[PDB]
Structure formats: C-alpha cells, structure tokens
Amino acid sequence: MRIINADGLILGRLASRVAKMLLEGEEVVIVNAEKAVITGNREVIFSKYKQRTYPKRSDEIVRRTIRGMLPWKTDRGRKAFRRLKVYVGIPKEFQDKQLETIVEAHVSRLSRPKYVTVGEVAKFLGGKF
C-alpha cells in the first residue's frame, strides 16, 4: 500500500493523483486529511461548501472529493474506491511507516498562496473534526 501525508497538499490535485493510483490497483491510505488545503478566498470557500451541505467531517470531505474523480457509477470505479482509506491525523498503525507526499500538489509551489485547510472548513460546517 501507499500512505500519503496530506499535510499542505492542494485537495483537488491530491484527489486527481490518488484517483489514478486507485484505478491502477494501488491501495492508498491518506493520513492528516484535515491538513490538506483548498485554495481561494475563505468566505467563498465556506459559502461553497455551506451550500453543498454532503459530509461535514474532514476525512469524509476528502473521501467524497476523490469519489467524484472516479468513474463512480461503474464497476471499475466502485472497486477502486474500495481500496481507499482516509484518516484525520496519523493513526497509531501508520506512525512508524514511510509517509509519502505528492510534490506537484504542494501549496508551497504557488507564488501567491491563499487557502484554508479542510479542517477549517469542517469546523465551520459543524463537523466533529
């Protein structure tokens, strides 16, 4: 399996790359889901997700975003989605494992980064975490 640390990764980019991994047969675990980021204006992002509510918890938001990038309705999409596990923080079983990142998804690769974390969106919506 491949364990990805979502800390500082742009949600959309993270989701697109992970969807491809799942379709290619890889088992993917995402940790620190609440630390992934969404670029844009804070009020606009909050409003957008407020209208969608749809999961309100960080891990669920990340899971749903990835589901939308897969051929969900098909048999190939369902099988791929089954190989995904998402968690907030880093559960005990993954604390001493190698955590990978996705360089292309780093928000730090942006010149003028404006963003909020998934956790901040979850808190705003009333999610547990």
UniProtKB/Swiss-Prot annotation:
Gene3D superfamilies registered for this protein in UniProt: Ribosomal protein L13 (3.90.1180.10)
Keywords: Ribonucleoprotein, Ribosomal protein
Any Pfam family matching the protein: Ribosomal_L13
Coiled-coil stretches: none
PROSITE patterns assigned to the protein according to its UniProt record, in alphabetical order: RIBOSOMAL_L13 (PS00783)
GO biological process, alphabetically ordered: negative regulation of translation; translation
Keyword Ribosomal protein: yes
Taxonomy, superkingdom: Archaea
Disulfide topology: none
InterPro entries for this protein: Ribosomal_uL13, Ribosomal_uL13_bac-type, Ribosomal_uL13_CS, Ribosomal_uL13_euk/arc, Ribosomal_uL13_sf
Any one GO molecular function term: mRNA binding
Entry GO terms, CC: cytosolic large ribosomal subunit
Family, similarity comment: Belongs to the universal ribosomal protein uL13 family.
Protein name: Large ribosomal subunit protein uL13
Organism: Pyrococcus horikoshii (strain ATCC 700860 / DSM 12428 / JCM 9974 / NBRC 100139 / OT-3)
Taxonomic lineage: Archaea, Methanobacteriati, Methanobacteriota, Thermococci, Thermococcales
